[PDB]
């Protein structure tokens, strides 16, 4: 069944004929370029072109496919770079797969799920201790440009090496050179073999930027519904929302706030609800999501950022002021949160970290108010001294992930006072020296945690740290 193009402009076409076409149906133009039926009007069809549109004109013919908007899926995509249509961009030939999956798909309903209970370890102390992510969780990464958002997700993917977790990095609206840089960084850390890379680069037409996250979602859903575990990164949804605005405005749909369409919330909410933790009956598989938002001047109260904050199960807010003051990763402890919390942590970490976030939020408030005069009473002085030390522990270099067992020991040390007699400038070296000591000499304690997920005997642990302490020389 055929239709003819009446008018085309900016990658949007109005098509005569195609009387029997479905809403959301995949269409093929004369020259092999795909399209999507978006509007079924009284005697024409609104069609968004999903590819190069220079060779499409008035008179070009369009064929229905009788299939809903779909993408290739499966193990053939691992280690490959594809666009939102599933076509290989890396120039290593075709994607040998028999299995497909629809781009729009219903989310797991209320009865199909289980409460999130299994860690997804980022390897970043700040996150795994204070803002713990779990399998099936949606956790927003939000912050200005150059606050360290992409490096959080890249480090998280790298840390899934050998954890039997399939990763999907969706790149919406980035420059393509940057995306090539990302794949190369993954290759060098031997993380590309279990990672799919979806990319709608900044030069692509808006509808591909719009679809890119839904394609990546379907690619990860495949693994979830077979009882395996996946991780999807949308970098970023700010550029996707802008692209959907461009599209909505080109189709002359009435604009609202900041010229976005009324359904821009729905755009993100349907996407992120499809990430979940399934019940035991449905296979126990999971899809974990890390959507990104790029703020302007740290404004987390803007329209699109608040939308995505209200959708996800928490957020990790990064700030420039923190970054440049040497707090890296630059996590605003007060505004960040994990709504899943302790449930997404091993019992050891839940014990040592329990109140860590609330303790630091109080530290940061009390620190701001202490530089405004007063010679402080000894109680608040000690709280500030404990606070500066725990802050130093939560600093962490880029691409240097820590095992959870080593994080629990490090956080245990500082929170039980074992660094109170050490200079603040020495805390980070104390930690590095402590853990190399624990690995070489006290591995039976570390191993307890890896196996049981519980703390070892606190008396044995206290002794082992105090043993280390006697061989530590401060700097001042």
């Amino acid at each position: 069944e055929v239709g003819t193009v009446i008018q085309v402009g900016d990658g949007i076409a109005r098509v005569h004929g195609l009387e029997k076409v479905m809403a959301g149906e995949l269409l093929e133009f004369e020259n092999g370029v795909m399209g999507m039926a978006q509007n079924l009007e009284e005697d024409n069809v609104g069609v968004v072109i999903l590819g190069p549109y220079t060779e499409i004109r008035e008179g070009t013919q369009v064929k229905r496919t009788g299939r809903i908007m779909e993408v290739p899926v499966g193990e053939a995509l691992l280690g490959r770079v594809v666009n939102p249509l599933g076509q290989p961009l890396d120039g290593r030939g075709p994607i040998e797969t028999a299995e497909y999956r629809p781009i729009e798909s219903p989310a797991p309903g209320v009865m199909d799920r289980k409460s999130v209970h299994e860690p997804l370890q980022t390897g970043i102390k700040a996150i795994d201790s204070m803002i713990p992510i779990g399998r099936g969780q949606r956790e927003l990464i939000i912050g200005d440009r150059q606050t360290g958002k992409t490096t959080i997700a890249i480090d998280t993917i790298i840390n899934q090496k050998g954890q039997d977790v399939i990763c999907i990095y969706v790149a919406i609206g980035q420059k393509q050179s940057t995306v090539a840089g990302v794949v190369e960084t993954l290759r060098q850390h031997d993380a590309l073999d279990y990672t799919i890379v979806v990319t709608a680069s900044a030069s692509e037409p808006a509808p591909l930027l719009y679809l890119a996250p839904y394609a990546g979602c379907a690619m990860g859903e495949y693994f979830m519904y077979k009882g395996k575990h996946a991780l999807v990164v949308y970098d970023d949804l700010s550029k996707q929302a802008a692209a959907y605005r461009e599209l909505s405005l080109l189709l002359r749909r009435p604009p609202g706030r900041e010229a976005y369409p009324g359904d821009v919330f729905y755009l993100h909410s349907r996407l992120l609800e499809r990430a979940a933790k399934l019940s035991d009956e449905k296979g126990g598989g999971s899809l974990t999501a890390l959507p990104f938002i790029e703020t302007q001047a740290g404004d987390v109260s803007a329209y699109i950022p608040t939308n995505v904050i209200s959708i996800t199960d928490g957020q990790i807010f990064l700030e420039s002021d923190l970054f440049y003051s040497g707090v890296r990763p630059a996590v605003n402890v007060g505004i960040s949160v994990s709504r899943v919390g302790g449930a997404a942590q091993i019992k050891a970490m839940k014990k040592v970290a329990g109140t860590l976030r609330l303790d630091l939020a109080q530290y940061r408030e009390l620190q701001a108010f202490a530089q405004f005069g007063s010679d402080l009473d000894k109680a608040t002085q000690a709280k500030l001294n404990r606070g500066e030390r725990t802050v130093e522990i939560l600093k962490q270099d880029e691409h240097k992930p820590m095992p959870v067992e080593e994080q629990v020991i490090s956080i245990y040390a500082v929170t039980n006072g074992f660094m109170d007699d050490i200079p603040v400038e020495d805390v980070r070296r104390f930690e590095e020296e402590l853990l190399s000591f624990m690995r070489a000499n006290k591995d039976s304690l570390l191993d307890h945690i890896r196996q049981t997920g519980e703390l070892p005997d606190t008396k044995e642990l206290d002794a082992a740290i105090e043993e280390f302490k006697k061989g530590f020389t401060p700097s001042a």
């Binding site: 002359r252 749909r253 009435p254 604009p255 609202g256 706030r257 900041e258 010229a259």
Partner: protein, 57 residues
């Protein structure tokens, strides 16, 4: 001590004098920003209302 007290209260007169003047100076540049923002809110809000209405009319 009394010369030193006069000197304290002279120094404080002129330090808080400057802080008062610097505050008025900052109030000019803050008023200027407030009113750019006030005006832009009204301007931008209306354009949105009118853009929505022109997609139907």
């Amino acid at each position: 001590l009394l010369d030193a007290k006069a000197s304290e209260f002279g120094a404080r007169m002129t330090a808080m004098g400057n802080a008062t003047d610097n505050a008025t100076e900052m109030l000019e540049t803050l008023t200027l920003q407030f009113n750019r923002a006030r005006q832009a809110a009204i301007t931008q809000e209306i354009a949105e209302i009118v853009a929505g209405a022109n997609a139907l009319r």
